[PDB]
Design a protein around this nucleic acid. Structure first.
Lengths: 98, 94, 109, 81, 97, 85, 109, 94
DNA sequence: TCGAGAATCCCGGTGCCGAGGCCGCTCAATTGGTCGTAGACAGCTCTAGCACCGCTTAAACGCACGTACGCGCTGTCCCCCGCGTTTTAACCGCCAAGGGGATTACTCCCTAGTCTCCAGGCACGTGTCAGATATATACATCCGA
DNA sequence: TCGGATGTATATATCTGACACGTGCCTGGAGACTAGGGAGTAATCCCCTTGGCGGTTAAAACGCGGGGGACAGCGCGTACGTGCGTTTAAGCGGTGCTAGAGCTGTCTACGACCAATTGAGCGGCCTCGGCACCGGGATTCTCGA
């Protein structure tokens, strides 16, 4: 009979691996295209330094990871282990972003 | 005896232009004084930092216009920019 | 013979004082020198924002049958706008109160 | 020109970000909601950075422009100048 | 006897206090508390009359805003009563702890 | 009459905390809220008053002015209108 | 005859430069004039805070068998203190990571 | 070609005093440069505002000491004040 | 409570590129005088902060009752996790072109600094009307039969 | 669905103190003039940004099976809301005193400014050892019988 881990065992192993490393978790090329698309609406024919795109990516990942920390606390407060869209909305409301 | 200064005279003139028949209490006049002083320092501080980034030593009307675009949101910034441009053109023509 | 004196505000068509704003900029340690158009531009923007608030506050005062403007009227004007509420989002107004608001789940069936 | 680039932020990448935050179970409607939040964040920062670039009369966004824009919003970043 | 039902007088009080603007803490007890706290930083201090008023206006505005956020957390958990855990969660997300 | 003060946090009574919560729009209050609220207020007041006394000492004065309190609140991101400035 | 030159840092027993700090204060539009003791006081405080961080970061580097200090070591030093974490509470450190932390309810029985 | 300046030389000197056998990478040196510049501007800005409230026109060591008490928390402020006082006394004695 | 399987730790050997040190050299800090004003100190005037006393009453406190809300337990079902298979595009290395950032010279116009002069804005004084307060309704809302 | 009880909106009459407006005056803003350096413009050099191509493999996308977590329903008990009778201290008006904030006049020492002079710190090379990577074995943690 084949081997299978139970649900939630591989998930905990991945939490430990990613909380120990420091590299970026979004692919470089798709992120660069998204940044250039957004800037078109403010000005045409712009150029970016290489380090400018890196600075934007470091700030964006740090913002999202912090948001997921607060979202997790709201879900536990309601006796759950699954994060839901209403958990994200409550966190952004109290933080004053909305 | 030292004597102090405020914006009460100028605020009262503006009120008589948009509502010619309404007054204002002294407590409410104190709040408007705080508002004008607060906005003045926000704009002047940002324009001061702008001149330092670009290695200039003068604050001109160009630095004021860029600071207003950074601080005011949305449609407020568009209306304020056109007011400032119109006043400078009229002052220069005379 | 010297010509008759004339305020800098009158030649710009403003009500806020251009001379006083120029002095405040010079003695606030913002830069080494101040251009001639900077005080005119700044005075016009301050006057514009004052007109916006006073217009909305006067509407609120007349709404509840009053002649004068009190701090409660200023608070109602600010929190009911969308842009003014965003510009003054970290400010407390003394003797202002709050907006009436009750959550829907608390109402009786 | 470019279009439809928000879908390049895939579902596996969003899962890795939540794992670093310590999340164990994710519902299926999270992925579309996360993309909307990221787009709002990037619009605010990039609009300020282009304003700094124009005042200097340049055609290239520098790393210093991005650092100033982040600091104006209470989001100071170390390690780029 | 004409007893009202539970929660009917409570909704009446919400409407009354959300329409007025006066201060809700007694003035003499608040003044004593301020003077007690300050003596730990420095002895033999005097206060201007408007200084104590400014402190009270800021303290009430801070607490009323905190109660607004606490109420949202309790509803998120399918409740109408507020509990100490609701206050703790709100202060943690706001970054005060 | 430099007589000390003690146990003044109890002057913030239960009815006063109830009025503050009604303005925030809450409907039912549990019995352990009152002790919790007193602890939160004490922490807030300590931070503001410590800064105000620092401003008073640098000017070499013995009286806390309303200007001192306004500067301290602004330094913590809680700007207040209506007391000068 | 002029006496031998002597740095202002050496007279105060410091390592951070007192002359450069004095120039930066003069050309930063902070006030009209700068006193002679202000640069000395400021340089000493900056040097003290640098020593605090580098000492904790070096402990972290040796903890996981390394010779040099990398950005991950600086982040571990800062977030594990109580006062340093409060002074730098709004700062992001590039290539720093996070502290390992899992909520207790998520662990298996 | 213009040449720039940093705090890299002075940071390296301090490191050799608390850990005589450890080095540092270039990425980590960039982070320490950002830290020193950030703290410098926080202290100088607060001391500038202090002189304005009290109608002075000079920044002295008294204004620096009051600014450090406002910004640094707890035991960090106590240790920093004694470091600054000792350096000024030694500089004046010579 | 035990075996089988899969993941993770530990160790030895190889190789490379970045940290650390060394050499010119030039520009910024230091030394030595001069001078004018910002700030320290003494003296004096009068505002306002503190302490006390008697009294009227609105608010705080304590007690009894009952209902509705919080919480624990059960059952079901469908959504989300773990895993194997195929498909796609990210990444790497290497060319090649030129758009634009950065530096240097030159010149002139805009801003600071003085001095005279006069009108705008501040402190004070005064009278009346907008708003606060008491009373007597008129009507809307809640609750049990 | 409806009547009784309670709370609240509305209209009338009366007072009172704060707002709005004169009046005198003084100091800050305006007019006219001079001198110097900050910034605008042209020219030039070279770096670093953009675009393209081909190969390799790691990651993304898809489908499927089933375990467990979310959610609805039910029952019970206790804690919190409502209301009444008694006790406490806040608010108010009015005296009285002195501590200290605020203003004014002298006078000196300290910080700006300028001109020589030289050594500290920056840019540009070299070079070797700390760390990255691969492969093989040991140890541990999970899962079912």
């Amino acid at each position: 009979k084949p081997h299978r881990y139970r649900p939630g065992t591989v998930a905990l192993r991945e939490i430990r691996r990613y909380q120990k490393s420091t590299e970026l978790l979004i692919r470089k090329l798709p992120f660069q295209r998204l940044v250039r698309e957004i800037a078109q609406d403010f000005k045409t024919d712009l150029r970016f330094q290489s380090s400018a795109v890196m600075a934007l990516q470091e700030a964006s990942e740090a913002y999202l990871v912090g948001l997921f920390e607060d979202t997790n606390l709201c879900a536990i407060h309601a006796k759950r282990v699954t994060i839901m869209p209403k958990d994200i909305q409550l966190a952004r409301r109290i933080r004053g972003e909305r | 005896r030292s004597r102090k200064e405020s914006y009460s005279v100028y605020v009262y003139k503006v009120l008589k232009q948009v509502h010619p028949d309404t007054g204002i209490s002294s407590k409410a006049m104190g709040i408007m004084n705080s508002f004008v002083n607060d906005i003045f320092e926000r704009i002047a501080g940002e324009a001061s930092r702008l001149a330092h980034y670009n290695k200039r030593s003068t604050i001109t009307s160009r630095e004021i216009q860029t600071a207003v675009r950074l601080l005011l949101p949305g449609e407020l910034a568009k209306h304020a920019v056109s007011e400032g441009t119109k006043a400078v053109t009229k002052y220069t023509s005379s | 013979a010297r010509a008759k004196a004339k305020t800098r505000s009158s030649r710009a068509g403003l009500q806020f004082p251009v001379g006083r704003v120029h002095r405040l900029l010079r003695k606030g340690n913002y830069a080494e020198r101040v251009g001639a158009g900077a005080p005119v531009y700044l005075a016009a923007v301050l006057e514009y924002l004052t007109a916006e608030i006073l217009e909305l506050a006067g509407n609120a005062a007349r709404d509840n049958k009053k002649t004068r403007i009190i701090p409660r009227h200023l608070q109602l004007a600010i929190r009911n706008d969308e842009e003014l509420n965003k510009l003054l989002g970290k400010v407390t107004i003394a003797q202002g109160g709050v907006l009436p608001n009750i959550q829907a789940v608390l109402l009786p069936k | 020109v470019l279009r439809d680039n928000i879908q390049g932020i895939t579902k596996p990448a969003i899962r890795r970000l939540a794992r670093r935050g310590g999340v164990k179970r994710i519902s299926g409607l999270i992925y579309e909601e996360t993309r909307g939040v990221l787009k709002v964040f990037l619009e605010n920062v990039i609009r300020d950075a282009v304003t700094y670039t124009e005042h200097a009369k340049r055609k290239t966004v520098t790393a210093m422009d991005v650092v100033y824009a982040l600091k104006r919003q209470g989001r100071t970043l170390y390690g780029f100048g």
